[PDB]
Design an enzyme around this catalytic site. Sequence first.
Site, PDB file in Angstrom:
ATOM      1  CB  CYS A  69      -0.724  -1.077   3.941  1.00  0.00           C
ATOM      2  SG  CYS A  69       0.645  -2.087   3.400  1.00  0.00           S
ATOM      3  N   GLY A  90       3.070   2.970   1.860  1.00  0.00           N
ATOM      4  CA  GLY A  90       1.915   3.736   2.256  1.00  0.00           C
ATOM      5  C   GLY A  90       0.612   3.284   1.640  1.00  0.00           C
ATOM      6  CG  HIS A 135       1.183  -4.065   8.736  1.00  0.00           C
ATOM      7  ND1 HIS A 135       1.648  -2.810   8.403  1.00  0.00           N
ATOM      8  CD2 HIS A 135       0.639  -4.575   7.607  1.00  0.00           C
ATOM      9  CE1 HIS A 135       1.395  -2.572   7.126  1.00  0.00           C
ATOM     10  NE2 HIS A 135       0.787  -3.628   6.619  1.00  0.00           N
TER      11      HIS A 135
HETATM   12  C1  LIG Z   1       2.010  -0.908   3.476  1.00  0.00           C
HETATM   13  O1  LIG Z   1       1.853   0.417   2.982  1.00  0.00           O
HETATM   14  C2  LIG Z   1       3.195  -1.622   2.826  1.00  0.00           C
HETATM   15  C3  LIG Z   1       2.985  -1.819   1.308  1.00  0.00           C
HETATM   16  C4  LIG Z   1       4.227  -2.364   0.602  1.00  0.00           C
HETATM   17  C5  LIG Z   1       5.403  -1.409   0.457  1.00  0.00           C
HETATM   18  C6  LIG Z   1       6.094  -1.826  -0.831  1.00  0.00           C
HETATM   19  N1  LIG Z   1       5.010  -2.454  -1.578  1.00  0.00           N
HETATM   20  C7  LIG Z   1       3.959  -2.770  -0.832  1.00  0.00           C
HETATM   21  O2  LIG Z   1       2.929  -3.320  -1.239  1.00  0.00           O
HETATM   22  N2  LIG Z   1       3.393  -2.918   3.506  1.00  0.00           N
HETATM   23  C8  LIG Z   1       4.556  -3.270   4.058  1.00  0.00           C
HETATM   24  O3  LIG Z   1       5.557  -2.546   4.026  1.00  0.00           O
HETATM   25  C9  LIG Z   1       4.619  -4.633   4.747  1.00  0.00           C
HETATM   26  C10 LIG Z   1       4.643  -4.443   6.274  1.00  0.00           C
HETATM   27  C11 LIG Z   1       5.637  -5.533   6.753  1.00  0.00           C
HETATM   28  C12 LIG Z   1       6.139  -5.172   8.149  1.00  0.00           C
HETATM   29  C13 LIG Z   1       5.046  -5.327   9.203  1.00  0.00           C
HETATM   30  C14 LIG Z   1       4.406  -6.714   9.192  1.00  0.00           C
HETATM   31  C15 LIG Z   1       3.954  -7.184   7.817  1.00  0.00           C
HETATM   32  C16 LIG Z   1       4.980  -6.920   6.716  1.00  0.00           C
HETATM   33  C17 LIG Z   1       6.733  -5.454   5.684  1.00  0.00           C
HETATM   34  N3  LIG Z   1       5.927  -5.224   4.468  1.00  0.00           N
HETATM   35  C18 LIG Z   1       6.374  -5.485   3.210  1.00  0.00           C
HETATM   36  O4  LIG Z   1       5.672  -5.327   2.231  1.00  0.00           O
HETATM   37  O5  LIG Z   1       7.658  -5.883   3.164  1.00  0.00           O
HETATM   38  C19 LIG Z   1       8.178  -6.129   1.819  1.00  0.00           C
HETATM   39  C20 LIG Z   1       8.628  -4.856   1.139  1.00  0.00           C
HETATM   40  C21 LIG Z   1       8.908  -4.867  -0.224  1.00  0.00           C
HETATM   41  C22 LIG Z   1       9.341  -3.706  -0.868  1.00  0.00           C
HETATM   42  C23 LIG Z   1       9.486  -2.528  -0.153  1.00  0.00           C
HETATM   43  C24 LIG Z   1       9.211  -2.499   1.202  1.00  0.00           C
HETATM   44  C25 LIG Z   1       8.776  -3.659   1.840  1.00  0.00           C
END
Ligand SMILES: *[C@H](O)[C@H](C[C@@H]1CCNC1=O)NC(=O)[C@@H]1CC2(CCCCC2)CN1C(=O)OCc1ccccc1
EC number: 3.4.19.12
Lengths: 303, 303
Positions: B142, B140, B41
């Site tokens: 991920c 960030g 992603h």
């Molecule tokens: C990557 O750095 C990030 C890690 C998240 C941010 C908050 N806590 C974590 O572990 N991952 C994401 O933001 C993923 C990416 C997503 C969009 C693209 C396709 C797959 C899913 C959305 N996502 C996510 O974790 O969404 C939930 C969330 C929860 C809290 C804050 C932000 C996002």
Amino acid sequence: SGFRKMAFPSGKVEGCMVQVTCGTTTLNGLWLDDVVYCPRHVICTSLNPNYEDLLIRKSNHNFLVQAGNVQLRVIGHSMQNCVLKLKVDTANPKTPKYKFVRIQPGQTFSVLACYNGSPSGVYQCAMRPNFTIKGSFLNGSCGSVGFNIDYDCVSFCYMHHMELPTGVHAGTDLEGNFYGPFVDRQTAQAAGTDTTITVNVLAWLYAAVINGDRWFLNRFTTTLNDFNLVAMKYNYEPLTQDHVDILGPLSAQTGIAVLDMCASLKELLQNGMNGRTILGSALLEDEFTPFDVVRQCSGVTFQ
Amino acid sequence: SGFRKMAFPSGKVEGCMVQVTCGTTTLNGLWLDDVVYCPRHVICTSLNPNYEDLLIRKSNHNFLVQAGNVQLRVIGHSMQNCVLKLKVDTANPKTPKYKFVRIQPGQTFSVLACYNGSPSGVYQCAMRPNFTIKGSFLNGSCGSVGFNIDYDCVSFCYMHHMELPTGVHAGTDLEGNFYGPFVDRQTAQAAGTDTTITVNVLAWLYAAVINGDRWFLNRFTTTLNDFNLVAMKYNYEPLTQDHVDILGPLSAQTGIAVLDMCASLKELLQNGMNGRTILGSALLEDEFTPFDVVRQCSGVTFQ
Ligand SMILES: *[C@H](O)[C@H](C[C@@H]1CCNC1=O)NC(=O)[C@@H]1CC2(CCCCC2)CN1C(=O)OCc1ccccc1
Ligand SMILES: *[C@H](O)[C@H](C[C@@H]1CCNC1=O)NC(=O)[C@@H]1CC2(CCCCC2)CN1C(=O)OCc1ccccc1
């Protein structure tokens, strides 16, 4: 989100760890530039041991230092308080930027547990008010160090020396000065009564709120004096205005006044938790500083 | 003695961590030999995103990889399940011996939390029965990985992808296959009901006994069937004969038969802890495996 007991990445310290052997005693040393630091009770002989006497009877070659599978030639030795300084003919090419700092009770640090100069595990510890640490240390772990990292600079604060009868741990700063009223002999020394680190509990309650645990909040408030009357009764250490100030950023991020959180802690002390948990714990946790909470609930790295 | 949530030393993994940027998205990559692994992603564009479509529209130069302050030239890219493989023109000289292994629920691993390719902290996690992990991850993070170390060999088991609505974390093995029924899109996915890892609780009770906590022991015993009737009622997962066998060494070291410890766990479930603690916890801890207990309560290192 989430909240975990987090240690600093240990790589910078792993590259400093060596094995020091005198006679039948083996422990860990810390190799920075051309000096290896290690607990002086490695000084071997064939309680009442006079370490000055023991050391004057020793030669450089009596100390075997192994850096991995490479033997380091000792070219000098000296005692500094309760640590030995072994001068070696090779500067450690992995020496990070570092400082020797002494920490305060209430402050936290990471411990790289080591055996035979080889790192085993890393975990986070706090200096207890009684100057012990609740560590995890077996035979051979002496010379393992505690540290913090601030960008690229390693602040060494702790070197391990012994275990006390209650299973807690005592050691020195890196200049060889013991934390607390302990000595590196075999006597009847004991930890002495501890207290709970109040400002850290409050920091961790703020971490909980940041992470969605709110059930312990209430509409009441309290004065600092009134709170400290309750702290005394539950063996919590007094909260000062500087503690209140240090908690300001966490207060501002959550919108919960520090004295309001104190009102919550007061009720938690008087009522227990009634079968509930906070951040996966059924106890009030006191081993996270306000800095630790901000670091984790905002995400500072180190390079 | 002592018992702590201990992570593996992280140095071997720190040297693999890099920063991967596509457009406005930045996350972490894992650089092993001449490949950088990262969550797919990251694939940027100016839920329903078809990643095959998105990737075919991308060029090598659309991916900026930074290894510290050195830019890595991407010479190829491919998708493997939910991870991107970025071929770079430079093999990582710090590549440790490694394997890609997929772990079982109940198993533990260390997480090196990273931001912008820079390690931030290290902590120990367990794969929950519902294939989530209770981590600590911000924006960030991920591409941060989970791993175990076995002498000198790093077994990578986890790469971080997302947070679920309850604040727990989901990700893949290093071949890009998700743990559990989760996908890398924005949908209404939720963790699903969890259970307590029974064999691990028993391991941790054995750690307690090794460390001097004995108050929860009793003279009663139980059959495996009778214990599992009680486990079901408290949402503990069933105990198998293989779990009993795995606990044999800990049984033998303490002299407490596995089924006797089960009798103790049964009473702890039916009665609570009555204001007492075990290894500094007021909850039954299930994130230590029998291996973890033996490692810590015996002291295995890694080189
Ligand atoms: C990557 O750095 C990030 C890690 C998240 C941010 C908050 N806590 C974590 O572990 N991952 C994401 O933001 C993923 C990416 C997503 C969009 C693209 C396709 C797959 C899913 C959305 N996502 C996510 O974790 O969404 C939930 C969330 C929860 C809290 C804050 C932000 C996002
Ligand atoms: C150094 O590797 C070792 C670390 C101990 C072993 C058990 N847990 C630890 O943290 N330190 C010691 O053994 C010190 C050395 C000692 C003799 C020389 C002068 C200073 C003190 C005795 N000692 C110690 O910790 O004694 C208590 C103890 C507790 C449990 C097992 C063994 C020893």
